[PDB]
Amino acid sequence: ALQNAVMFDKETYDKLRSEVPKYKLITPSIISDRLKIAVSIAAAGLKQLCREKLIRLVSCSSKTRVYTRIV
Amino acid sequence: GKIRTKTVKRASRQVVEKYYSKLNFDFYQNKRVIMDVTIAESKKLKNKIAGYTTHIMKRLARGPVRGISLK
Amino acid sequence: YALKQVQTFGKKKTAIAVATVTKAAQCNIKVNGVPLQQILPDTLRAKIMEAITVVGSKYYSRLRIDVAVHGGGQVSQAYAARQAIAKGLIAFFQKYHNEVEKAALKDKFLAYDKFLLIADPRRCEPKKWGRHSARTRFTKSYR
Amino acid sequence: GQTVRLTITSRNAKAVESVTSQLLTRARDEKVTIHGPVRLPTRTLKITTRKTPCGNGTNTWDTFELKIYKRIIDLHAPTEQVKKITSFTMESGVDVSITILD
Amino acid sequence: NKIHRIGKRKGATLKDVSAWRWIKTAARHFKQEGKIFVPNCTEIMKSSHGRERAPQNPDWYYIRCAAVLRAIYLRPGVGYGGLSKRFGNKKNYGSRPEHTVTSSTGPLHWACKSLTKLGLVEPGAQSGQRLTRKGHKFADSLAFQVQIRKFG
Amino acid sequence: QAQVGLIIKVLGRTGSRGNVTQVRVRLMAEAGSPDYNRTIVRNVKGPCKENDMLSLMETEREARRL
Amino acid sequence: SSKTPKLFNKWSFEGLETSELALRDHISTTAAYVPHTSGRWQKRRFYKARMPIVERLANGLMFKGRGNGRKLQAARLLKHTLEIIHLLTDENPLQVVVDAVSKGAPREDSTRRRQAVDVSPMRRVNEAIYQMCKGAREAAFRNLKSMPECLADEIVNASKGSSNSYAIKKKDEVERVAKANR
Amino acid sequence: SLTLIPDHFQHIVRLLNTNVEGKRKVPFALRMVKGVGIRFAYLVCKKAGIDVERRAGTLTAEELEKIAEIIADPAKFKIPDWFLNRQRDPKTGKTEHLSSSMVDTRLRDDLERLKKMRAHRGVRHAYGLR
RNA sequence: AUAGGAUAGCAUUCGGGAAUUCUUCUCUGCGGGAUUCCUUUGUAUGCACAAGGUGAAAUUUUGGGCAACAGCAGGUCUGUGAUGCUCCUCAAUGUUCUGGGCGACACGCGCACUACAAUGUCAGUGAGAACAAGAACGAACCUACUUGAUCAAAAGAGUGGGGAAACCCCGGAAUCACAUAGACCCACUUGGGACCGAGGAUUGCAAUUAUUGGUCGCGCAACGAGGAAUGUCUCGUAGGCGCAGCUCAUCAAACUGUGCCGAUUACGUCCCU
Ligand SMILES: [Mg+2]
Ligand SMILES: [Mg+2]
Ligand SMILES: [Mg+2]
Ligand SMILES: [Mg+2]
Ligand SMILES: [Mg+2]
Ligand SMILES: [Mg+2]
Ligand SMILES: [Mg+2]
Ligand SMILES: [Mg+2]
Ligand SMILES: [Mg+2]
Ligand SMILES: [Mg+2]
Ligand SMILES: [Mg+2]
Ligand code: NA
Ligand code: NA
């Protein structure tokens, strides 16, 4: 039913870069729901933001990634 | 669920009748006396006999009991 | 100087952990040669670590504790090692300290958790025939 | 010197213990060094068969067990002395084997 | 400082550091140095017949060689059967119940041969494999570098 | 709103299947209230014993004696 | 040198209490480092009321055939759930869990036609935990959302009495039916 | 994986008369071709030099031609004989790898051969039995 | 550290050499230990009970085995050189040998196994059980190590060891764990693995998927949680997970045991049976 894109577009990408930060709770599933993208590329984008200090890693496991906005 | 069967009760009554002067209100010393003055293949049976013998001594403190005859 | 060494054991299911605690130049606790901070998962490390934190780390100041654990699985081995470490601290204080300090430590341990010093006696119940394990019976059908 | 090992095995616990005790006493009378006796792990032989002949009724089983006890004693004595120590009327069902260790 | 040495402790040996961190650093060293022999069949086979797919990691042979080196460190005198037990898995058998399958001995033999060619592993006295002096030195030096968090 | 009641005695398990307990509960109210020390018989499901506490949605209904 | 335990070394037990007075003696607030405490909690009837509440939550996540006995997995799921709850509510997640367990069960029920009965506090706690775990498990069955996210959403909604909670909806329906069967 | 979608992205990719789903990763979209499984798809990607983390539909025409030429004749690209699904053809004796419609056609040929010769496998397949 | 959070300490390690010393852990023949023993409540004479204590253990300690008297036209004449009476008895209903069959199905039922997926499937790394079995000058039997290997698996070959607390073996089981910064992202899909094709090897005197492993294909076979009904179960239990033995030249979706991870609920009643 749902159509989750498997690649970033320009619009969904700057939405990830600008709107995903300042979310209080950030997970790949939440960002996938908001941006209508697959959880894999959502996780990749969140990892990219994490590398660049845009977001803060709160809880981490091999299968679970929880992020939050920077204070 | 700890009823004393007639074997244990009969043995305890015999023990109290024959060895009244060697018993007291203590289970452990009475157990030693009973191991000395009885024959039985069962350690658990001797322990139950000692328990009911101590009960009989405690009762015999507060007046006579049925089935025990002493001078 | 004297040796100042005691040996204790802990048990949980079929896991047997032997803890050798020795007065050393520095606190050092290892389980099967692995330091405490390297033990995984963090839940089982937290279980083992609470043999130290419930009494406080100052009572392990100059003690080297090596725990060799065999048998059981990961959870049971962790619990056995935890019990062995707590009992080893108690035994060391019994051997080389007053009774007041040993009693204080023992009451703290027993207040937190009884199985820190007393072994859980539970064991696997043997299987019976006509059953698939200790208690579940063969499926019955009528028609 | 040289070590001689007696391996005492039997399926009757009382018989194996009696033979082991008698050997211990005889060796102590000879003033020889003794290692043991070591009570080796007891092995249980299990045969679990259906109780019924044919195949009718609730599938009930019999569990037959046979337990084997083994003891070993080491004597620091010559072969002649060990042969002297083991020369007595042994309880039936007890197997005593003599072996020289290296 | 996080990497500060806990007072009166100095240096590091194996078992003092994360096993995976050590294996990753050792595999990185093997790949970067470029002297380890990698069989061409590593790029075609599965690591075991109990797996259903290829190892999915391009550096899987280096990681396996590092893990085998660490295993030989932990157990001197281990042969390919022991390593097969260590690297085994549970197999999917379809509609039949699952069973444990030991790892294929062949890749473990290849890994031990590659480690031997580097001088890190030698035949053990009375069968098996064991670390050389150089292998032990390499293992402990890598353990210290991991403790220091350098990784290259 | 729910009033809090204190179980002061267990009168016994009621019902055919024994899943209900008949208890005497005292309404734990402030002094000077009409329901102060007021006691009432209530049917209770779940494991309960003396000195447990209940949340009475209604305090006007009494359970029929058993 | 001995300090009070904090759950997963970060969540404080200090001041942890339930607002529901009738559930005061059946929700355990003893400090613990992890949910895992291998104790014999089912030996006596009410001994399970002393088990720490987060461990009772962990025991509720072990239900189906695929989840039977996976207690370390449940502890990890709860570790992530508490972080998500803290991000959502900015409160102590232990307090949120306690409040959800307080509000997640009906106070009046119906039994066999049917008569309205009252629910013992022990059953209130049991049913709250059971219903929250059931709703979280069923919400995550075929869903992008992970199990910790669903569990955190369910617990946060139950702590506020929101009808978006599965447990709150079930409790409201049960209580309404029981008021109908007075 | 942090790469913006190309303007030539294809939701349906045509490879050996097969409709390959572009959203899938390349080896798991290659397994959509009959005669190509997961192992074979990974090996073909490794022989073609294309990254397995890319999505199909981003594959250009030359990449698809190279992949098709590898799948058609895997032995020419040093893929071992034991990796192929028809190693000594009972009629021709040659080793090959059947892909796409040739899998079904060769299955039809095998069944007709076992049926015309009246072997037990052939007559059982005639009856449809297991 | 690609950024590397949280989590005790403020000289350590090396089952690939010796020397003493000792029994905490392991081994075990006979012992000890628990009994309503102690204290309160309701019973209220006794017989007891419920909470708590003591304690490794607190009520048939826990789990088994044994288990009276009466019967059943219950099963077995397919266990026996257990058997009465009847049938066959040289082209035999005796006994061998050859080849089929006991396995055939668009069918119904009982008991399992595998699933329907993200509390997951794949790839990696880590730590880690317990019952057990091993052969009939040598030779069967079980194994380790090496090799095959200058290139897949399964194999095939050597050299050793073990009569089994000695070798296997420090028994690296699978559930499990992983801050692996791995792939997949809700779809009959990298779920599922039925059905089937081609090569090859192995047990056996003899094997066309109907011996059995292994490789690549097939997967576009259902199956997305299952109607009326219905089974089992109260603590190291259910469930889940493997392992061993037994059958066994070869083959466990079975049984008999074993350990591992480990709960929910009740501690009641006579509504149903
Ligand atoms: Mg492993
Ligand atoms: Mg599976
Ligand atoms: Mg399967
Ligand atoms: Mg299974
Ligand atoms: Mg989900
Ligand atoms: Mg009949
Ligand atoms: Mg005949
Ligand atoms: Mg899992
Ligand atoms: Mg599929
Ligand atoms: Mg699959
Ligand atoms: Mg069978
Ligand atoms: Na049956
Ligand atoms: Na296959």
From TrEMBL, chain A:
Molecular function per GO: structural constituent of ribosome
Highest taxon of the lineage: Eukaryota
Recorded family membership: Belongs to the eukaryotic ribosomal protein eS25 family.
UniProt protein name: 40S ribosomal protein S25
Lipid metabolism keyword on record: no
Protein species of origin: Leishmania major
Presence of keyword Ribonucleoprotein: yes
Keyword terms of this UniProt record: Ribonucleoprotein, Ribosomal protein
Cellular component, GO, one term: cytosolic small ribosomal subunit
UniProtKB/TrEMBL annotation, chain C:
Gene3D superfamilies: 3.30.230.10
Keyword Ribosomal protein recorded: yes
GO cellular component, one term: cytoplasm
Coiled coil: none
Swiss-Prot/TrEMBL GO biological process terms: maturation of SSU-rRNA from tricistronic rRNA transcript (SSU-rRNA, 5.8S rRNA, LSU-rRNA); translation
GO molecular function, one term: structural constituent of ribosome
InterPro entries per the UniProt record, alphabetical: Ribosomal_Su5_D2-typ_SF, Ribosomal_uS9, Ribosomal_uS9_CS, Ribsml_uS5_D2-typ_fold_subgr
Highest taxon of source: Eukaryota
This protein's UniProt keywords: Ribonucleoprotein, Ribosomal protein
Species this protein is from: Leishmania major
Name of protein: Ribosomal protein S16
Annotated family: Belongs to the universal ribosomal protein uS9 family.
Pfam families given in the database record: Ribosomal_S9
Automatic annotation (TrEMBL), chain E:
Source taxonomy: Eukaryota, Discoba, Euglenozoa, Kinetoplastea, Metakinetoplastina
Acyltransferase keyword on record: no
GO biological process per UniProt: ribosomal small subunit assembly; translation
GO cellular component: cytosolic small ribosomal subunit
Organism in which the protein naturally occurs: Leishmania major
Record protein name field: 40S ribosomal protein S19-like protein
Binding site for Mg(2+) 1: 86
Protein residues bound to Mg(2+) 3: 94, 98
Gene3D superfamilies: Winged helix-like DNA-binding domain superfamily/Winged helix DNA-binding domain
Coiled-coil annotated spans: none
Keyword list, A-Z: Metal-binding, Ribonucleoprotein, Ribosomal protein
TrEMBL record, chain H:
Major place of residence: cytoplasm
GO biological process: translation
Localization annotation: Cytoplasm
One function term, GO molecular function aspect: structural constituent of ribosome
UniProt keyword terms in alphabetical order: Cytoplasm, Ribonucleoprotein, Ribosomal protein
GO CC aspect terms: cytoplasm; cytosol; nuclear lumen; small ribosomal subunit
Family per record: Belongs to the universal ribosomal protein uS13 family.
Protein name per UniProt: Ribosomal protein S18
Naturally occurring in which organism (per UniProt): Leishmania major
Residues of the full protein shown: 67 to 196 of 218
